Symmetry: D2
């Protein structure tokens, strides 16, 4: 006759303690914040990116605070580099339990002025690289046989188009569907949950042209933000850790709204 | 030069300890589970519903496990009863910090056989009651001046129609938009976040004609569940507590996917 | 070996000639335009609304141009008035083949200042009335046994919330799901297609405060209009007639985007 | 005081007579049907594809029925071939007014068994080729200065994931967002409307293992089809011609539902 919920489950459901979290784009604005948040929450953090100097600086900062972390240099669009990077993570920590995909690139340009090569450059850096990293990490999680969590950072641009964004919106719109299809491929058979988060823009990225009366960018975002402010990377730490823990075990194939209401107004 | 995320924030972001959580439909399958989960997580729980016998049984069960809880009897569609119930919660705990709306009703019937009165009965019990409870609790949160969290349980039926569901789908589809509009009304000015969760069906609700070969209900849901199983109410505890804590402070006006991939396949 | 498409089908697929089109809210900005467009396209037009003076003026204008039309006075939220109005249409024209639902009401107000009675007033006028008219017309189409077309005018607000719109967004968000559920109830068994159109605002409705520098309404819509201008009612004539003809025979349960890109940017 | 709609507009709004319609994937199941429908509706049809034998057979069939048509051989992923093909269309007809993109490719495979090269093959043939054709045709429409219409055939898979579809769903999900972004780039400044149609599957594509009791494909689609049947290519002729005519002048950046209710149930 007792309610079907366990105190031990509730007390520990948000935990990532002792889990190995592999973070791509770890040197980025969101990547460095998520990497340190996983570390602060007790995960072993394996950071990856192309920028070795920035990875080394993060590793030193984190180790000084007792975070168990390491890094591997790799271009996420290059499958041989990604494969070798996962091998190094596995040699260091024995397994991969959580993957957070945060790397990305954009170069807005109207379709008329944007060459096919320039559109492809965005697709390779932002979309192909998501397939590469997810395929190779999912294979590693399958090989382990313990399930796993994959969190892909897309954008609110995955669901709304924008002038100059034929490259970025195709990549992000595609990645949200890639995520839903990966959940169809992996969740039931292997216990690997695959979800995306769709953020709005960060405040720091709009600071340069913020004081220009000729620019409406900063204003356009605020009229469209029911939350009442632009985001900071720390605003998505809760959602990412939620999607990386037992608390979200039933959640898969979702494209989570991190827009502060931009998507629903 | 340090990464912009604080250890104290990460360690405590999912906390609901010491918060007053008011749960409607507390006697229901999800309501009783969410009410006990808030209690296990250290919130003061104020349970509400029309069924006094069931509320008393939950209060006794919870108190035996050291949960600080109370109840108030009210029909959530009755604004005088809802106002008296919130006053009773305030007399007991001094404030309301979290609201979880879980009550509901359905009676599927084809439009041709469903009277206008029967469609209205579903709208009153399932949609009007959401407006009543959210309005009165939001007013109480405004009066306190400390912000708050509102979590409305809608359904994956808020985004997908179904035969016999002209009542329920209108109510749920409407409640998702009511939530997005409430965030536009309250989040920026008052710090009240308003979100919904959109669950798929519970396993226990399909168990009776599960052994009936003439029924395709049980199988229809499984072909459409990438997660690979039907849900239990405890599968939504993580999402509800996430949306009731500091970890989701930037998240407002969202209609969160709790479908296990039903919405994205 | 011939391509599977018929010239006779292509030549006549957009036709509404000789069909009986029942238009609710016929006295409104969109209603009068749609009613005259059905007439110009050769349909028999039965106009309905509460405003008899305006219905009489439209009937005289249309008859002077050789349009076969008639009217019936009814409050669309009142099932006895709707039932009697359909009987009068059937006595005049023998059947109903197309239904276009265009009536509506809004009174924006923040949830804190909007009474439950005021929210209900919008729900009754804008949502309940859609259920009433669709149920009674669908029953008439079932009784005829020749199928039919139902086009419900909702709003882009059916998918995006807005400050002060807890009444209107609930009603419109609900009506889109009611439409999808009605298609589940009626399309396969009775050949009745049920779709909605989701328009952006009309230019004429924003003309009053257009010259006010303190108002950002007119500007906010234009930043969010990829089409580059606000709409006129005549801009939705094509979509409504398309959804009322053989050209859309496979299309049902859809919530059609008439936003000029507001929904997708 | 007359209603704001013109008889001349209503009578001619669905016309494509005398317009030059360039159809990609013209040899395909939908392409051949759309190409002949444009011809039957009086457009000059320029068919393109890689299969010359099939293009020649369609040209002979169409000319025998008085259709003014021509063809140009090109791989739509090859920008030099696409540029030469558009030049050939211009040499033949002097301009391009309508573009219908219907070519595509799929090879379903689980992410674990699908190489990065195989995923890229689908992206190139199904997504990159859409960018190539739309960019070069949009440039031609800009050069003419008379506006234009672009209709991209995506899939209901642009909004719903599926097992084995990480290639196809990324491509289609991306193309819907590419369409919305192209409307942001072109519609206001150049009068070029850009929309997609999202079809469900064709009956003929499921006929081979339809008699196989071990297969649930045929039944899975029918439980999810409120329209009550699988589609034929001719079922999308109305929507494509609607989106290619004056009747849809305000419609841009839309991803039109051609799913028969699969998307909304
Ligand atoms: N910031 C914002 O306002 C928003 C961002 N997004 C998206 O969210 C993600 C995180 O954003 P944010 O942290 O600000 O991103 P950043 O601009 O800080 O970039 C993240 C990291 O991506 C890597 N990167 C850059 N270019 C490429 C490339 N050509 N190929 C592969 N990797 C590359 C870099 O790491 P390294 O050089 O070490 O490889 C960089 O540090 C990105 O995908 C971004 O597109 C979504 C919504 C809004
Ligand atoms: N269970 C499922 O499979 C799914 C449920 N949902 C929705 O999620 C919510 C929670 O579901 P679940 O816990 O299973 O629901 P229940 O069937 O257990 O009902 C929840 C509570 O609602 C109250 N209630 C019942 N009828 C009415 C009414 N006429 N007016 C007001 N309150 C009423 C009852 O409490 P009391 O008598 O104490 O007032 C009941 O205990 C509901 O809104 C449901 O519609 C969504 C997706 C799937
Ligand atoms: N105009 C716009 O900018 C937009 C409008 N919409 C919606 O599209 C529809 C058509 O818009 P539009 O033509 O401009 O609307 P109108 O403002 O012109 O109203 C349409 C008709 O609805 C009837 N009506 C008014 N109040 C009520 C009520 N309380 N109960 C029942 N019927 C009522 C009136 O007819 P009578 O008095 O004869 O009964 C009126 O002529 C409406 O539902 C509107 O909400 C959607 C997007 C934007
Ligand atoms: N048929 C269905 O059930 C559904 C189809 N779709 C999509 O709608 C579109 C039309 O469908 P349908 O007519 O049945 O498609 P088809 O299978 O008949 O293919 C369309 C044409 O695409 C061309 N094509 C094939 N492979 C490639 C390739 N590698 N690169 C470039 N072009 C290629 C071929 O023309 P050629 O050899 O002359 O170049 C083919 O005739 C496609 O994009 C399809 O993916 C969407 C929903 C369901």
């Amino acid at each position: 006759h007792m309610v079907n919920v366990k105190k031990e489950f509730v007390d520990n459901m948000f935990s990532v303690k002792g889990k190995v979290a592999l973070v791509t784009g770890a040197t980025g604005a969101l990547g460095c914040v998520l990497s340190k948040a996983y570390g602060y929450a007790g995960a072993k953090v394996f950071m990856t990116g192309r920028n070795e100097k920035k990875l080394q600086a993060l590793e030193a900062e984190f180790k000084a605070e007792g975070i168990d972390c390491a890094y591997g240099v790799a271009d996420p669009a290059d499958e041989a580099q990604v494969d070798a990077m996962i091998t190094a993570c596995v040699a260091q920590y024995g397994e991969v339990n959580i993957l957070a995909v945060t790397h990305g690139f954009n170069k807005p340009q109207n379709i008329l002025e944007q060459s096919v090569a320039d559109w492809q450059y965005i697709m390779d850096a932002d979309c192909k690289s998501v397939y590469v990293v997810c395929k190779y990490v999912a294979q590693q999680m399958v090989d382990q046989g313990k399930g796993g969590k994959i969190v892909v950072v897309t954008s609110q641009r995955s669901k709304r188009g924008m002038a100059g964004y034929t490259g970025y919106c195709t990549s992000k719109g595609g990645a949200d569907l890639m995520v839903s299809s990966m959940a169809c491929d992996l969740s039931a058979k292997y216990g690997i949950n695959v979800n995306s988060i769709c953020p709005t823009v960060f405040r720091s990225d709009l600071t340069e042209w913020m004081f220009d009366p000729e620019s409406a960018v900063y204003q356009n975002f605020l009229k469209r933000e029911p939350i009442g402010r632009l985001a900071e990377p720390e605003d998505f730490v809760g959602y990412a850790l939620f999607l990386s823990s037992d608390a979200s075990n039933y959640i898969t194939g979702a494209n989570c709204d991190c827009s502060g209401g931009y998507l629903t107004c």
